[PDB]
């Protein structure tokens, strides 16, 4: 240290990403691997995910939030509020509980850190109390995704952040499956991190398929921008 790059300096170009998830939902075990790249300058993520154990036992859209918030575009005036990059390269742990309304829940733990040049997201997911004939195990969700805001606040006692948001998944009959997300992030290292003022991230996501791919898979294009803090002191405009 004598470490060439630290914090936000690691994200000035395109960074390769590797995602590994091991899952168990109501005793259906599965694994997912993902590869792609992130460009934090534009808040852009491009990834392809493959279920390596056969058919995915839950709908792909239910895994989007779980499957690297480091790649969010933070405006210059908000750079001091970017907890995610400030925790790099040593990384952070992200913990979630995701409540599917009138159905089961996911509990997840992810370690996000660099291994050399590659940003790695290693996840374990446990799902319980799902209805075998409900929207999730019954595969009744559309293969699509809506835009959402994700709300971030500092948790000074844990030297981390707390995050909450609700996802609305479209059901094939025109209705909505809600998924309430509760999230906390904690740094792995003992170094200083940036603890943000209240703000949010705005997500857009597009799901597609690789026409040449026979394995069960999802192609994801996603844009993420921080917002909710304005540039005043004096009124610039």
């Amino acid at each position: 240290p004598f470490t060439v790059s630290k914090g936000e300096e690691l994200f000035t170009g395109v960074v390769p990403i590797l995602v590994e998830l091991d899952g168990d939902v109501n005793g259906h075990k599965f694994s997912v691997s993902g590869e792609g790249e992130g460009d934090a300058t534009y808040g852009k993520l491009t990834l392809k995910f493959i279920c390596t154990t056969g058919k995915l036992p839950v709908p792909w859209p239910t895994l989007v939030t779980t499957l690297v918030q480091c790649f969010s575009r933070y405006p210059d005036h908000m750079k001091q509020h970017d907890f995610f990059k400030s925790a790099m390269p040593e990384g952070y742990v992200q913990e979630r509980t995701i409540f599917f309304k009138d159905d089961g829940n996911y509990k997840t733990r992810a370690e996000v850190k660099f291994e050399g040049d590659t940003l790695v997201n290693r996840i374990e997911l446990k799902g319980i109390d799902f209805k075998e004939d409900g929207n999730i195990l019954g595969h009744k969700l559309e293969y699509n995704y809506n835009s959402h805001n994700v709300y971030i606040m500092a948790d000074k006692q844990k030297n981390g952040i707390k995050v909450n948001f609700k996802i609305r998944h479209n059901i094939e009959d025109g209705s909505v499956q809600l998924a309430d997300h509760y999230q906390q992030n904690t740094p792995i290292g003992d170094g200083p991190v940036l603890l943000p003022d209240n703000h949010y991230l705005s997500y857009q996501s597009a799901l597609s398929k690789d026409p040449n791919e026979k394995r069960d898979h999802m192609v994801l294009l996603e844009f993420v921008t921080a917002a909710g803090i304005t540039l005043g002191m004096d009124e610039l405009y």
Side-chain angles (χ1 to χ4, degrees):
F2 319 140
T3 301
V4 176
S5 297
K6 63 191 158 298
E8 81 105 64
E9 306 178 341
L10 287 169
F11 292 92
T12 64
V14 179
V15 176
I17 306 169
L18 173 57
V19 178
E20 292 189 306
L21 176 156
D22 288 322
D24 179 334
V25 183
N26 277 35
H28 301 274
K29 295 169 190 294
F30 62 93
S31 296
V32 170
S33 298
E35 302 183 11
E37 57 189 36
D39 188 349
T41 299
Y42 310 105
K44 186 180 190 160
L45 287 171
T46 55
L47 291 136
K48 182 185 172 180
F49 299 98
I50 295 159
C51 181
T52 62
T53 52
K55 196 195 193 166
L56 196 69
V58 299
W60 278 107
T62 70
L63 298 182
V64 167
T65 55
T66 297
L67 292 168
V68 300
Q69 296 189 301
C70 330
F71 295 99
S72 300
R73 184 176 75 85
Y74 271 76
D76 181 86
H77 75 274
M78 288 179 67
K79 295 286 205 216
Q80 71 265 45
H81 302 282
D82 188 348
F83 163 84
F84 308 101
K85 296 186 189 55
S86 83
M88 295 298 155
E90 288 171 279
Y92 56 75
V93 173
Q94 178 208 79
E95 295 175 293
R96 293 213 180 105
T97 306
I98 304 174
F99 300 90
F100 293 87
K101 195 172 168 50
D102 299 317
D103 210 335
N105 62 93
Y106 293 166
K107 294 197 158 271
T108 64
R109 184 173 196 283
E111 276 184 43
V112 190
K113 70 177 89 80
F114 277 90
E115 294 287 352
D117 277 356
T118 302
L119 191 279
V120 180
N121 183 199
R122 299 169 166 97
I123 314 146
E124 39 175 39
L125 178 152
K126 185 74 164 289
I128 65 170
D129 290 330
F130 288 89
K131 298 170 179 171
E132 296 288 329
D133 69 304
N135 293 324
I136 293 87
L137 291 176
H139 290 266
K140 307 188 182 173
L141 305 187
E142 292 189 337
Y143 190 72
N144 57 30
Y145 220 89
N146 303 316
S147 303
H148 299 89
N149 296 328
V150 168
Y151 300 94
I152 300 180
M153 47 199 310
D155 182 358
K156 273 166 170 209
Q157 294 212 2
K158 294 289 215 167
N159 203 36
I161 59 174
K162 280 176 151 291
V163 176
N164 73 107
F165 57 100
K166 316 174 107 187
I167 299 296
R168 302 200 158 71
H169 297 293
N170 290 358
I171 308 174
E172 273 167 357
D173 67 355
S175 190
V176 170
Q177 170 72 63
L178 192 72
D180 286 279
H181 286 65
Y182 296 82
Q183 164 183 342
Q184 73 184 28
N185 298 57
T186 301
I188 290 177
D190 34 56
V193 294
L194 302 176
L195 302 176
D197 286 353
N198 294 353
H199 68 283
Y200 64 94
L201 300 179
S202 178
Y203 276 79
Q204 301 161 251
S205 311
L207 311 197
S208 65
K209 298 290 190 181
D210 178 354
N212 286 302
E213 178 63 68
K214 298 285 173 27
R215 295 171 292 180
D216 198 2
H217 72 285
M218 163 175 70
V219 177
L220 179 62
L221 171 65
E222 189 163 72
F223 294 95
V224 190
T225 311
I229 295 169
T230 45
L231 53 92
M233 282 289 299
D234 303 62
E235 270 191 359
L236 276 192
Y237 317 96

